[PDB]
Design a protein around this ligand. Structure first.
Ligand SMILES: O=c1[nH]c(=O)c2[nH]c(=O)[nH]c2[nH]1
Length: 223
């Protein structure tokens, strides 16, 4: 029952895909029964939707959770506070963080503070088989996250989208079709590094766009 698993706003917003969420629940049970594992932990799978739907001002889109055991924590790109070294994508994100914003290197890879402040860290696919990158594509997550993005875009509220998962022509449509949605283009991914990602200034440009739409900027500062 969605209201059990996600925040009040999110439970209402995701009502249309409530059965598909239940189905993914049956999928993950079937995987354990079949002797395959999944990440992140069951209690972290919908973690992105445990922060207030109404407060979201930025969407960061990834593709799939980290396939390495102990990395995936149910926020796109985030890792648990004791994870070191950081995955490549997150080191790349943090290099852009310091360059764009001028802040020092974060103390750890926990992006929880971004989530608390209205950054939706959403992966298109919300589970993965450990050590098998992108193993859960086409298992039914795509409809769920599409609806989430659709719902978010439909709010009479400012939204900036950052696309770090390369599915631009998949996602540009839903978003472009909302009232007050700005999409950061182009769509370099963290692993494209110095071929487009570094200097993309996603953070400062999100804040310029929010203030331009009469919204408060995000405080991007991590501890
Ligand atoms: O394209 C991606 N790369 C990652 O390294 C990653 N990590 C994550 O949670 N989502 C994504 N998406």
């Amino acid at each position: 029952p969605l209201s059990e698993l996600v925040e009040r706003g999110w439970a209402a917003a995701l009502e249309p895909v409530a059965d598909q969420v239940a189905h993914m629940g049956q999928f993950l049970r079937a995987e354990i029964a079949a002797g395959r594992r999944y990440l992140p932990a069951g209690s972290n799978v919908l973690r992105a939707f445990t922060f207030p739907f109404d407060n979201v001002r930025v969407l960061i889109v990834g593709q799939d959770p980290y396939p390495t055991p102990g990395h995936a924590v149910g926020l796109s790109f985030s890792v648990a506070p004791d994870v070191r070294p950081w995955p490549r994508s997150l080191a790349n994100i943090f290099d852009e963080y310091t360059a764009d914003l001028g802040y020092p290197l974060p103390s750890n890879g926990d992006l929880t503070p971004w989530a608390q402040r209205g950054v939706l860290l959403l992966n298109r696919v919300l589970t993965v088989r450990p050590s098998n990158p992108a193993s859960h594509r086409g298992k039914g997550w795509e409809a769920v996250t599409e609806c989430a993005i659709r719902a978010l875009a439909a709010r009479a509220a400012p939204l900036v989208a950052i696309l770090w998962g390369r599915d631009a022509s998949t996602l540009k449509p839903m978003l472009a079709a909302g009232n007050c949605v700005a999409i950061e283009s182009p769509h370099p991914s963290p692993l494209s590094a110095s071929r487009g990602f570094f200097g993309s200034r996603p953070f400062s440009r999100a804040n310029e766009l929010l203030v331009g739409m009469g919204a408060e900027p995000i405080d991007w500062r991590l501890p």
